[PDB]
Structure 1
Amino acid sequence: SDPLVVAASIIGILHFIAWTIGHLNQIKRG
């Protein structure tokens, strides 16, 4: 009777996937 807080959770794990991409900066050329 309150999936509002849980629903938002999906957003937390989601950003993680993208976080991996940004890593590209820390490797090539440095």
Structure 2
Amino acid sequence: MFEPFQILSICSFILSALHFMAWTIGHLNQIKR
């Protein structure tokens, strides 16, 4: 945690994974199994 910019990196990473997560489900709509 020496670099303060780490907080921005981790935050962006989390928001990035969650962004594609919701999007993927959105486009998929139905679970389809």
Instruction: Tell me the TM-score range normalised by the shorter chain.
Output: 0.3 to 0.5
Higher normalized helix content (fraction of residues): 1
TM-score of the aligned structures, taking structure 1 as reference length: 0.42
